[PDB]
Amino acid sequence: GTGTGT
Amino acid sequence: KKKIEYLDKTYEVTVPTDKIAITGSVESMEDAKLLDVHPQGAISFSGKFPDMFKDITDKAEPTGEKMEPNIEKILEMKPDVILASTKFPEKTLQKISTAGTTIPVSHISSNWKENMMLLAQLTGKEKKAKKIIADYEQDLKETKTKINDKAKDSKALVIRIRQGNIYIYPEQVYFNSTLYGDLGLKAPNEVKAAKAQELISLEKLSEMNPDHIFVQFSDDENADKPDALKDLEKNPIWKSLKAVKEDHVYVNSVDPLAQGGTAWSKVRFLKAAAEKLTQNKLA
Ligand SMILES: [Cl-]
Ligand SMILES: [Cl-]
Ligand SMILES: [Cl-]
Ligand SMILES: [Cl-]
Ligand SMILES: [Cl-]
Ligand SMILES: [Cl-]
Ligand SMILES: [Cl-]
Ligand SMILES: [Cl-]
Ligand SMILES: [Cl-]
Ligand SMILES: [Cl-]
Ligand SMILES: [Cl-]
Ligand SMILES: [Fe+3]
C-alpha cells in the first residue's frame, strides 16, 4: 500500500 | 535466541519456532505452503483463507488483510517473529515492529531462494527448502528444452489488473524473473524501464503489441470494477493487440493471488508458460 499500485 | 542473516541484515530470533505471524508477505505464505509450515498468524484474503492455503492455515489466526495488519491481533499472539513485507510503508513496518521481531520479506523475485531459506532457518527445514530449490532448478533445465525457439524469441508480457487498471512490473519482480530471466525471453522496454509496480495504459500496450499476454485478475483486487476483464476484452484498442487476435491471451494461468517471486510461484509459472507458449499441455 505505498512496492510503490501506490 | 539465534542470529539469523537475511539480505545483509541480522535478526535474533528464537529458532526453530512455529510462533510465526505473517502479514503483508504473501510470499512467505507461499513458502510456508511448500515447507509445510503452519504459522500462528496468516494473511486473510477477503476475510478468508484461500483453499490453496488451507493445509497450512489450520492452526492460524488472521493477521488481517494483506495490506492491513491488525496490530492488536498480532500483539495478542506475541509471536517469536513477524514476517512482514518490503512493500509496506516504512511507518507501517515500524508499527508492526511494536508487536515483535519483524523481518520485511523481499518482493524482489530474484530473492526467492533467500526468502525460502529464511522461513526454513526459522523452522528447522533447511534440508527441505534446499530440495525444493534444487527441484525447481532441475525442472527449469528440462522445461527450457521443451519450449520451441520461436516461442523463446517472442514478445511476451505479464499484466495484473487491480481496481480495473492494468499494471506491469520490473524485470526482477513478479513472474518476470521466470519469464525473462529463467526462460530467457526478452523483456520489453516498458518492463526494463519499470522502477516498481507501474500502471500501463491500454494505449501504450497497443504500441508494445506483444505476441503473448499473461493476464492475472483477482476478483478480490477488483471489487471496485468487477467486470474490468470483460470490459477490457470489448475495448477496440485491446482488440487491436496481436496477442488478442492470435488467441494468445492467458487469463489466470496461475492463481491470481500468486506473487511470482517464490519457489511455488515460479514452478507454477514455469509450467504454465511452457504450456501456453507451446500451446500444448505436454510441456
Ligand atoms: Cl471481509
Ligand atoms: Cl496501520
Ligand atoms: Cl524488529
Ligand atoms: Cl531467478
Ligand atoms: Cl519440482
Ligand atoms: Cl481505465
Ligand atoms: Cl517494446
Ligand atoms: Cl531504462
Ligand atoms: Cl488505458
Ligand atoms: Cl476470471
Ligand atoms: Cl479471483
Ligand atoms: Fe502491492
Side-chain angles (χ1 to χ4, degrees), chain B residues 4-8 10-11 13-17 19-67 69-71 74-77 79-94 96-126 128-129 132-137 139-141 143-148 150-171 173-185 187-203 205-223 226-229 231-233 235-270 272-278 283:
Chain B
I4 294 183
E5 201 214 73
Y6 175 67
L7 305 186
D8 89 330
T10 299
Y11 309 84
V13 183
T14 307
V15 296
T17 178
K19 291 188 75 199
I20 298 168
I22 302 173
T23 180
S25 183
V26 181
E27 287 80 7
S28 296
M29 300 281 289
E30 297 185 30
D31 293 333
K33 192 202 173 40
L34 296 189
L35 285 176
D36 193 32
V37 171
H38 297 239
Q40 174 175 22
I43 296 167
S44 58
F45 303 77
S46 305
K48 63 179 216 168
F49 296 132
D51 283 0
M52 67 182 168
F53 293 123
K54 286 190 180 304
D55 48 301
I56 60 142
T57 61
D58 60 335
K59 307 186 172 205
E61 297 171 49
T63 55
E65 298 293 303
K66 180 180 80 178
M67 267 183 243
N70 190 312
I71 303 300
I74 297 175
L75 278 154
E76 224 153 67
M77 297 176 192
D80 288 344
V81 65
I82 299 165
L83 291 181
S85 173
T86 47
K87 297 182 286 170
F88 278 123
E90 178 52 43
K91 294 217 202 97
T92 303
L93 282 174
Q94 290 285 297
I96 290 166
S97 68
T98 66
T101 307
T102 302
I103 304 177
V105 177
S106 181
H107 69 284
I108 303 307
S109 300
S110 33
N111 291 148
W112 71 284
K113 293 182 260 76
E114 295 66 24
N115 290 359
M116 174 66 89
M117 291 302 311
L118 172 58
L119 187 56
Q121 288 169 13
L122 292 169
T123 57
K125 299 190 173 204
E126 297 88 340
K128 185 171 191 170
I132 289 161
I133 290 166
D135 288 347
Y136 173 74
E137 303 286 9
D139 275 12
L140 174 56
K141 290 208 175 185
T143 300
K144 277 189 287 185
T145 76
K146 299 184 191 76
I147 302 176
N148 131 298
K150 289 290 186 207
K152 288 163 177 179
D153 292 327
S154 63
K155 191 188 276 187
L157 187 72
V158 181
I159 62 171
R160 176 154 46 191
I161 294 160
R162 291 171 151 177
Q163 80 271 158
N165 293 317
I166 307 178
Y167 290 92
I168 57 161
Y169 301 81
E171 202 172 348
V173 172
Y174 200 27
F175 290 117
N176 290 340
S177 63
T178 302
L179 186 60
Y180 305 128
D182 292 356
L183 289 174
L185 278 72
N189 290 312
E190 291 89 342
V191 168
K192 286 191 183 285
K195 326 301 187 208
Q197 177 168 220
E198 184 169 276
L199 209 283
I200 192 164
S201 62
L202 180 53
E203 287 79 4
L205 181 56
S206 75
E207 302 189 302
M208 180 195 301
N209 207 32
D211 298 307
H212 294 100
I213 305 178
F214 297 82
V215 180
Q216 296 289 108
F217 179 88
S218 169
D219 291 316
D220 297 327
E221 305 182 331
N222 291 278
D227 308 320
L229 193 55
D231 283 12
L232 190 57
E233 291 167 343
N235 186 299
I237 305 308
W238 173 262
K239 288 159 74 175
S240 79
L241 289 169
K242 186 166 188 297
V244 170
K245 293 192 273 200
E246 298 182 345
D247 198 25
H248 291 158
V249 178
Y250 320 112
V251 177
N252 291 346
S253 66
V254 181
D255 188 281
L257 293 173
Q259 301 298 118
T262 77
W264 192 27
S265 276
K266 293 173 66 66
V267 86
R268 286 178 286 168
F269 187 83
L270 178 64
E275 172 193 327
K276 300 303 183 194
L277 296 170
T278 70

